[PDB]
Subunit: 206 residues, 4 copies
């Protein structure tokens, strides 16, 4: 609880007065040598130059954290981002797409049984989910307020006043803004924002 | 106050168990029936027809497979029990079944709830129009969930030392006495020598 | 020669369709019933009781959801149609449902078969004690599958220009005339103006 | 003539096994590596970078979990093995993983194939843009499948009495000698005293 301010990987999703969004932040202790990279309609969490090797030491440190498929934004702390986005692309409602992926992928097999978390949002709805050694949960994001979840400590949706009017601001906020400023070991962050004219990506370093 | 269908699962000083209770307004003409290693919620004599009016009112609410007890408010009881029987951990068996079956397509989008318990662990789950949830039942305390209102696990001091008592308790005992429209209930208890079934009417 | 429950799906010069036929030995006291956008296989008057003896004899064999027709030999018809209704491509909808429901737990491990078809594509699938299979129906030709013997898609020249004809054909027409113990059949046809239902008795 | 990634599974007079072979044109700079109870297909020194160009070229092709051997052409090897480890029959473990993972999103929609074998049974499966298939491997004979051309189980007289021989055979032996672009292979054999791993280069 209280003295444990290290949430590990964090993601937020929802809508505010300026538009819809998904934010993601990498918090790490054992692998801080990483950054976010923007590529065609996706943001990848990858090793910074010199540490390419790391992906061979740990299979959970490199993955697309954000995938944009049509009007849908997908965010997750691992390779399941692709699993989910692909299902949405091929036609599958958000809840099931997240549910099926997490159920199959399951929690990560590391020394902490690190959970797999994810969220997806489109024009009319948004869902957030997590899978751990103790269970599986996927739930509708209340339209009334953005929420966030992490792999450690905050392993269930938590309401948050996420103020941001662009992907750059969104990424900066989950990295240093509001309640997120208190969560330790920030490394890198990324976000996708949609003010109505489409999904835009952005990244932010410390 | 009207929770609709209710189920509880967990362990107490006397043993392990699953309890189930039918609460209904539109279909109160039902009872529980014990058959080989399962308890079915069925129409009382004269209303056989009902199953043809509504496809969610008749189903096995309890299935015993080996050392595992399965309880649910619908046909997914069989979907889950079958997977356990064929080898699948409780969490996934409940998760896969609920994900596929989904909430019931009635005027209320009535959720599908379920729980399963064996010698070492127990899980409880629910699927609704707003999501899916399957979670480990804390060994420290029994829990219960319903299709309406109490749509998330809630701790309960479930005192019972037999299937008969367990069934009677979810039907009229403790906090359950306040939940309206009781119709019928059933339960499975295991004091260590195996699963036993029982039913209780109002 | 006794294939048990049979279903066909595909397109011909007159339109798209799904046909279903009940072949039975132990439960021949059944018929098809048309209700809102679905066809149910149910007991004929006097045998309502049967559904309580065997849980696999009564179920919707056909469900129409928007531009999609779904057909299957069991309750998974609803599981699949619901997923399509909520947005899920045909292949996955059939795949997920069969994977979860699994083969029927009777003395024969009777397989669960299904097919779904819409404006652009169609899929057919089956799940048995030996595996799971879901595949794209070739646009070049209609196919059919059964719970016994013909447990894999088989091409068929399915001539029919209406649901009535389609139902009659899978019941007595072509190659289907040779399959024993026909009881009842139903079908859904779409000539471009929408899905229409029909049933045919012996 | 070019089958791409290939895997075989089954039993012969000497024991049980799973073999895997990487055939490639665009990425031939790879080898197999043995680590604790698993074999990984990885880039040879100097090409570490490749994994960042294509996400489907590096993955564990073989995982041993207890008495079970798992083989696949991609990261789903871990998805399947993990489910078996946590308790899930082989058919479902392969089915669920393939259904979720789906075919690879490359310029060829490269299928995901897999197989798993333990003391009593074995299953093989594949998922492609046209469908999903998981089926019981006949005990009477070993089978193999590939991502291209041979996209359905094919019987094979797989002679081998050790992991080394098994790996060598799928790489250059029998019918496999005719399949083009061999790069590296690996295998797991169980003569009754446990699973042993081995790799073979050209
Ligand atoms: N998703 C990630 O970026 C990630 N980074 C690390 N991990 C897992 O969590 C473990 C501990 O991470 P850390 O010590 O940075 O909190 C790592 O060893 C790995 O197994 C992840 N899931
Ligand atoms: N589980 C049950 O026994 C059950 N009984 C009814 N129902 C569904 O809930 C609806 C409302 O039931 P009630 O009026 O008992 O609250 C019914 O129309 C039906 O769709 C059930 N799922
Ligand atoms: N789908 C059906 O209509 C059906 N009817 C019967 N059955 C199952 O197959 C068994 C054998 O049926 P029959 O004797 O008609 O070949 C029945 O006892 C039951 O378990 C079915 N699946
Ligand atoms: N599993 C593998 O080893 C593998 N190697 C390559 N591939 C995918 O198949 C594509 C074509 O492979 P190739 O060019 O070797 O026939 C590659 O570009 C990649 O997308 C694989 N799945």
């Amino acid at each position: 609880r209280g003295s444990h301010m290290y949430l590990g990987r964090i993601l937020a999703v929802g809508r505010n007065s300026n538009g819809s969004f998904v934010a993601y932040r990498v918090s790490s202790r054992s692998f801080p040598n990483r950054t976010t990279s923007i590529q065609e309609e996706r943001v990848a969490v990858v090793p910074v130059e010199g540490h390419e090797r790391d992906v061979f030491r740990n299979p959970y440190i490199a993955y697309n954290c954000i995938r944009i498929v049509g009007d849908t934004a997908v965010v997750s702390n691992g390779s399941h981002t692709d699993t989910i986005a692909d299902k949405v692309a091929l036609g599958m409602n958000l809840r099931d797409a997240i549910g099926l992926s997490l159920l199959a992928m399951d929690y990560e097999k590391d020394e902490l049984n690190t959970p797999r978390i994810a969220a997806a949002i489109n024009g009319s709805e948004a869902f957030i989910g997590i899978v751990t050694a103790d269970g599986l949960m996927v739930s509708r994001v209340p339209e009334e307020t953005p929420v966030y979840i992490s792999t450690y400590e905050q392993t269930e949706p938590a309401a948050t006043e996420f103020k941001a009017g662009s992907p750059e601001e969104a990424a900066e906020f989950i990295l240093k803004g509001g309640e997120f400023a208190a969560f330790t070991h920030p490394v890198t962050a990324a976000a996708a924002f949609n003010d109505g004219e489409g999904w835009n990506l952005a990244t932010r370093e410390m």
